[PDB]
From a paper:
S from both SARS-CoV-2 and SARS-CoV-1 uses angiotensin-converting enzyme 2 (ACE2) as the cell surface receptor (Hoffmann et al., 2020, Li, 2015), ACE2 is expressed in a number of tissues, including epithelial cells of the upper and lower respiratory tracts. S consists of two subunits, S1 that mediates receptor binding and S2 responsible for viral and host cell membrane fusion (Walls et al., 2020; Wrapp et al., 2020). The S1 fragment, at the membrane distal tip of S, includes an N-terminal domain (NTD) and receptor binding domain (RBD). Although both regions are immunogenic, the RBD contains the interacting surface for ACE2 binding (Lan et al., 2020).
Author numbering:
A (entry chain L): 2 to 213
B (entry chain E): 333 to 527
C (entry chain H): 1 to 137, 143 to 224
Write the structure that this text describes.
C-alpha cells in the first residue's frame, strides 16, 4: 500500500512549502513512526525527519514534520536553492513492514509556473489491424518538472497497462513527459471513451479520446 | 588431602558468556588463596566482607566459583550495588556479598581478527535479576503492548547481543575473564579450609 | 565512520538470479538491523525487507516473498540480498541501509550504501513497429509511434530532415516487457495541416530497421 504524495511542491526563495503524505489508519494514522528523506539527483537519500517530527543532528530547523490523521506533512520554511531535491516519506505499516511514499520533487521557482499541455492520441487503424491498441498521452511545456498521470476508462480508473516516463528537461528549461496505455482492441471499442488526466500544482488537465 | 580445583576454573580452556555464567561448587578440599593473590596475572582482585590475607586461614562450608567474560568498562559492574547492563540483566551480586572478584585481560585468547561473536550478553529484560540469578531464556522481548508470538521485529527484540571483540579494540572494549569466588558459612561441617 | 560498500553493477537476463553484497565497517556489525531498498531509474524508493545481523531473522514485504533472500556472514560483516526469477521491471539500484536504532528495527536509515545497479535487459534485439499518429478530428498535432524496440536508441527525423520546426521527439518508455517505445510529434497550426507532406524516418541501427511512415488525416 503506497503512501500518496503530491508529485510537485514548489515555492519562491524564502517562502514556506508543505509536502503532504497521505496513508491509512494502519500506517500513518496508526503509528508515530513516519520518516522523511531528501534525495539530490544521483546521491543517496538523507534522513531529514524521523518519528513524525524529530530531526537528526545537522538537519536545519527549517525542516519540520507533523502528522494529522492519516496525513503527515513536511514543511520547509525559508526555502533555499539547495533544498531543490526529491522528498520521500516513510512509515511503519504493521506486520514488520515499512512503506515509502511516491515522492515529491521540491522545486525552487526560477521561472513562472507553466501548466502542462496535453495531447492524447487514439490507437491508429494500422495498430488495430495488428490486434493491438495503444493510447499515447504527450505532456510538455510544464514547470516545475513533476506530474502525476491518471488514466480513466469511461469514468472509472485504469491502472493496468500504464507506463509513464519520468520528467525530462526540454531545450527551453521546461519539462516534458509521456504516458502510454496498452489495451486490447476489444477494450478500446467497449468503453465509450478513455481519458488522460494530468495533475500539476493542484490543477489537472484532462484529454479524452473515443473510438472511431 | 585433595587440593581444591581452582586450576580448572581460572585456567579453563574456554569461558562462558555472561548471560549463561558458569558456576563451580568447591567443597571437601584444601586451597591456598595466597597463591591466587600472589599471582600478578590479575588486573582486578577486590574482596568484600573478608580480606584476602585472612582468607587462607578461615574455613567455609562451600565456595562457589562463578566465571564468565565481559568487556573492559563493564568490569566495574561486578561489585555489590552496581548498575549497568551486566549487573542488572546478566550477573548481580548481593549487597551483603562475602567474597572476591577476580578479572584479567583475555584479549589474546577471546579475540578474532574479524570479531569474536561467541560471547553474548542479555541486552533486554523485563526486570532486574536477583543476586546470583541466571537467565538463559531466548524468548523475544515484548517491548510494546502488542504480543510478539515468537516473531522478531517491531517492538519485538532479540534479547541477546554479541560483543565485538576484535584485537584492535580499545581496552574498555577488550574481553576480560572474570572469576567471582563467594564463600558461604552454612551452619554445617566446614570442609573448604585454607592452608 | 560508518561505511557500507556494495558489490559492483550486474547485468542479468529475465529468469536469472542476482546476489548483491554489502560489507559494513566502522561499527559493530551485529548491533544494527540492515534494510534493503531498491529504486528504479527515475522512479521512487521501494522498501524490500530487513535482516538482523545478530539473530539472522528476516522479514520481507509481500510482493518479494518467494523471490528475495536476505542472509549475512558475521565473520566478514557482509549482508547479502538475492533476487530470483528476475523480470524487466526489477531493473533498479539496490541499496543496503542501516537502521539507526541499536538492536531494534525502527525504519529510519542513517547510513546508505552507494548502491548496486542491476539491469535486467531484453533477451534479444527487436526492431520497432511504426504507426502513424493521425491528427485529431488553433494548433494541430501529428506524429509517429515507435513501438516495442530494443535496445536503445532509435533516431526519428521528419521529411529526411527537412522538417524540424515544431518537432519534439519524446524520450522512450521502458515498458515492463523490457521493450522500449517512443513517440515523435510535429505540431502545426490547425489551418495548415494538409498543406505539406509528413513522413517520419525511423532508424533503429541495432536491428538494421529503417522505416518511412507517411502520416495523414483519416476518413
Ligand atoms: C514477518 O513478520 C510477520 C508479522 O508478524 C506479526 O507482526 C509482529 C509485529 C507480531 O505482532 C507478530 O506476533 C505478528 O504475528 C510474520 O507474519 C506472522 O507469522 C506468524 C508465524 O509465527 C503467523 O502466525 C502470523 O499469522 C503471521 N501474520 C501475518 C500477517 O503474516 C512473518 O512470519 C514474518 N516473516 C518472517 C520471515 O519471519
Ligand atoms: C595457571 O597456569 C599458570 C601458568 O601456566 C603456564 O602455561 C600453560 C600453557 C602450561 O604450560 C603451564 O605448565 C605453565 O606454567 C600457573 O602459573 C605458573 O605455574 C607454575 C607451576 O607449573 C609455576 O612454576 C609458575 O611460577 C607459575 N607462574 C607463572 C607466571 O608461570 C598457575 O599456577 C595456574 N593457575 C591455577 C589456578 O592452576
Amino acid at each position: 500500500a503506497v503512501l500518496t504524495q503530491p508529485p510537485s511542491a514548489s515555492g519562491s526563495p524564502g517562502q514556506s512549502v508543505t509536502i503532504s503524505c497521505t496513508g491509512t489508519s494502519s500506517d500513518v494514522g496508526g503509528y508515530n513512526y513516519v520518516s522523511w528523506y531528501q534525495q539530490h539527483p544521483g546521491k543517496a537519500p538523507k534522513l531529514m525527519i524521523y518519528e513524525v517530527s524529530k530531526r537528526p543532528s545537522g538537519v536545519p530547523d527549517r525542516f519540520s514534520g507533523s502528522k494529522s490523521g492519516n496525513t503527515a506533512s513536511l514543511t520547509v520554511s525559508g526555502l533555499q536553492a539547495e533544498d531543490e531535491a526529491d522528498y520521500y516519506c516513510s512509515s511503519y505499516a504493521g506486520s514488520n513492514h515499512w512503506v515509502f511514499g511516491g515522492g515529491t520533487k521540491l522545486t525552487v521557482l526560477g521561472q513562472p509556473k507553466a501548466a502542462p499541455t496535453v495531447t492524447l492520441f487514439p490507437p491508429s487503424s494500422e495498430e488495430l489491424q495488428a490486434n493491438k491498441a495503444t493510447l499515447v498521452c504527450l505532456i510538455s511545456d510544464f514547470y516545475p518538472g513533476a506530474v502525476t498521470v491518471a488514466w480513466k476508462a469511461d469514468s472509472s480508473p485504469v491502472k493496468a497497462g500504464v507506463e509513464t516516463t519520468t520528467p525530462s528537461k526540454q531545450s527551453n528549461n521546461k519539462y516534458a513527459a509521456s504516458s502510454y496505455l496498452s489495451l486490447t482492441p476489444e477494450q478500446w471499442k467497449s468503453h465509450r471513451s478513455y481519458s488522460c488526466q494530468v495533475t500539476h500544482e493542484g490543477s489537472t488537465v484532462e484529454k479524452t479520446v473515443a473510438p472511431t | 588431602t585433595n587440593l581444591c580445583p581452582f586450576g580448572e576454573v581460572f585456567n579453563a580452556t574456554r569461558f562462558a558468556s555472561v548471560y549463561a555464567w558458569n558456576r563451580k561448587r568447591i567443597s571437601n578440599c584444601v586451597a591456598d588463596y595466597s597463591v591466587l593473590y600472589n599471582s600478578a596475572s590479575f588486573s582486578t582482585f577486590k574482596c568484600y566482607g573478608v580480606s584476602p590475607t585472612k582468607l587462607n586461614d578461615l574455613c567455609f562450608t562451600n565456595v562457589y566459583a562463578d566465571s564468565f567474560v565481559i568487556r573492559g568498562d563493564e568490569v566495574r559492574q561486578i561489585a555489590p550495588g552496581q548498575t549497568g547492563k551486566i549487573a542488572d540483566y546478566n550477573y548481580k551480586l548481593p549487597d551483603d556479598f562475602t567474597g572476591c572478584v577476580i578479572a584479567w585481560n583475555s584479549n589474546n585468547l577471546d579475540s578474532k581478527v574479524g570479531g569474536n561473536y561467541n560471547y553474548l550478553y542479555r541486552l533486554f529484560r523485563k526486570s532486574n535479576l536477583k543476586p546470583f540469578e541466571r537467565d538463559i531464556s531466548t524468548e523475544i522481548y515484548q517491548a510494546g503492548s502488542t504480543p510478539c508470538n515468537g516473531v522478531e521485529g517491531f517492538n519485538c527484540y532479540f534479547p541477546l547481543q554479541s560483543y565485538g571483540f576484535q584485537p584492535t579494540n580499545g581496552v574498555g572494549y577488550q574481553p576480560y575473564r572474570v572469576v567471582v569466588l563467594s564463600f558461604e558459612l552454612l551452619h554445617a561441617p566446614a570442609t573448604v579450609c585454607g592452608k | 565512520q560508518v561505511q557500507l560498500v556494495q558489490s559492483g553493477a550486474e547485468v542479468k537476463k529475465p529468469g536469472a538470479s542476482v546476489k548483491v553484497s554489502c560489507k559494513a565497517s566502522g561499527y559493530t556489525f551485529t548491533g544494527y538491523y540492515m534494510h534493503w531498498v531498491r529504486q528504479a531509474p527515475g522512479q521512487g524508493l521501494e522498501w524490500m525487507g530487513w535482516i538482523n545481523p545478530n539473530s539472522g531473522g528476516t522479514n520481507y514485504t509481500q510482493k518479494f516473498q518467494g523471490r528475495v533472500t536476505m542472509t549475512r556472514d558475521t565473520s566478514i560483516s557482509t549482508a547479502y540480498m538475492e533476487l530470483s526469477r528476475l523480470r524487466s521491471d526489477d531493473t533498479a539500484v539496490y541499496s543496503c541501509a542501516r537502521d539507526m536504532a541499536f538492536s531494534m528495527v525502527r525504519g529510519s536509515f542513517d547510513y546508505w550504501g552507494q548502491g548496486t545497479l542491476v539491469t535486467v535487459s531484453s533477451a534479444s534485439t527487436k526492431g520497432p513497429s511504426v504507426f502513424p499518429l493521425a491528427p485529431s478530428s488553433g494548433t494541430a498535432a501529428l506524429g509517429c509511434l515507435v513501438k516495442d524496440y530494443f535496445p536503445e536508441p532509435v533516431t526519428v527525423s521528419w521529411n529526411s530532415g527537412a522538417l524540424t520546426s515544431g518537432v519534439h521527439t519524446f524520450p522512450a518508455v521502458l515498458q515492463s516487457s523490457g521493450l522500449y517505445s517512443l513517440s515523435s510529434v510535429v505540431t502545426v497550426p490547425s489551418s495548415s495541416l494538409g498543406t505539406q507532406t509528413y513522413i517520419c524516418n525511423v532508424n533503429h541501427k541495432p536491428s538494421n530497421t529503417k522505416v518511412d511512415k507517411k502520416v495523414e488525416p483519416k476518413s
